[PDB]
Amino acid sequence: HHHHHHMVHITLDRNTANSWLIISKDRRQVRMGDTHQNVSDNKERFSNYPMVLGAQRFSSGKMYWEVDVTQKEAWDLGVCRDSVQRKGQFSLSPENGFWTIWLWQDSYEAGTSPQTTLHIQVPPCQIGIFVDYEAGVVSFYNITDHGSLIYTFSECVFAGPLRPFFNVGFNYSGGNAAPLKLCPL
Ligand SMILES: Cc1ccc(NC(=O)c2cccc(F)c2)cc1O
């Protein structure tokens, strides 16, 4: 792909983070803590899952960023509406305002309803995410495999401003402690 020139500098929004997440000083890395991180509760924080939003809001244009997922067993990545539900149980689906892929139990899937199997021969260490607001497109790329396409959501109905979306996953296994990192341009 040739989307690299739409690169945007994404930072994480502490106020949206689940209370167990640890966001780095530069707001470019996040990992699951082993305990509550001593923050107050608020209506923005994801309560049920280890999720956080980027600070940036997009309502037009073309945007590209990359995320490092090295040595994680489980994660969700993509974009979501600014107005997604924060509290309680929900599924990641376009009907609920999410355009995401994930890793879980050694398989990769797109967050359609129901979920779609992905075909990845080279497990990615970094994921590229491209959003074309006007076209209604969200695409995912395997940076480890020379930028190969993973999945395209098309005919997207964003229905509001979009925010970068992240889930570091639980760490019940002791094998999923590694961070998500926003990679440099
Ligand atoms: C299911 C659910 C609903 C609501 C809340 N949190 C609050 O309403 C809240 C707002 C301001 C200060 C505060 F401490 C809490 C957490 C939840 O998990």
Residue 105 φ/ψ region, left for φ over 0, alpha for ψ in the -120 to 50 degree band, beta for the rest: left
Is 42 a pocket residue for ligand 1 (Cβ < 6 Å)?
yes
Q: How far is the CA of 39 from the centre of ligand 1 (A)?
A: 13
Burial 87-109 (b: 16+ CB within 10 A, else e): eeeeebebeebbbbbbbeeeebb
The CATH number of the domain holding residue 134 is 2.60.120.920
Q: How far is the CA of 89 from the centre of ligand 1 (A)?
A: 14
Q: Are 129 and 24 in contact (CB under 8 A)?
A: no
Is 87 a pocket residue for ligand 1 (Cβ < 6 Å)?
yes
Q: Which atom of ligand 1 is nearest to the CA of 48?
A: 18
Q: Are 44 and 72 in contact (CB under 8 A)?
A: no
Q: Are 83 and 145 in contact (CB under 8 A)?
A: no
How many domains are there within the chain?
A: 1
Q: How far is the CA of 80 from the centre of ligand 1 (A)?
A: 21
Nearest to 92 by CA among 83, 82, 100, 81: 100
* Distance between CA atoms of residues 91 and 149, nearest Å: 24
Q: Are 162 and 80 in contact (CB under 8 A)?
A: yes
96: three-class secondary structure by DSSP: helix
Residue 122: domain span: 4-181
Task: Give the experimental resolution in Å.
Answer: 1.3
* Distance between CA atoms of residues 170 and 149, nearest Å: 27
Way it was determined: X-ray
E strands, 10-96, are: 21-23, 29-32, 51-53, 62-68, 75-81
